[PDB]
Amino acid sequence: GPASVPTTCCFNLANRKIPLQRLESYRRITSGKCPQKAVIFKTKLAKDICADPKKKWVQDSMKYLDQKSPTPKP
């Protein structure tokens, strides 16, 4: 589901568009200790999924959370 074996960064991007009502949060990665860069979405089922920033639902999803979100800090 979320991981497979190498714990570093997402690899298997999500194909099934995730809904907003079920979305809880999201996490993006782009550090230097990773082979690739992408985003990760979290639904309201205590589960995380991989997502690339070149999708239509991921972009809207990220923009949605980024828009709905108030401001970062922690």
From Swiss-Prot:
Keywords: Chemotaxis, Cytokine, Disulfide bond, Glycoprotein, Inflammatory response, Secreted, Signal. It is found in: Secreted. Glycans are attached at residue 71. One of its GO terms (biological process) is mammary duct terminal end bud growth. GO terms for cellular component: extracellular region; extracellular space. Disulfide bonds join 9-34, 10-50. One of its GO terms (molecular function) is CCR3 chemokine receptor binding. O-linked glycan consists of a Gal-GalNAc disaccharide which is modified with up to 2 sialic acid residues. It comes from the Eukaryota. Induction: Induced by TNF, IL1A/interleukin-1 alpha and IFNG/IFN-gamma. In response to the presence of allergens, this protein directly promotes the accumulation of eosinophils, a prominent feature of allergic inflammatory reactions. Binds to CCR3. Belongs to the intercrine beta (chemokine CC) family. This is Eotaxin. It comes from Homo sapiens. The lineage of its organism: Eukaryota, Metazoa, Chordata, Craniata, Vertebrata. The chain holds residues 24 to 97 of 97 of the full protein.
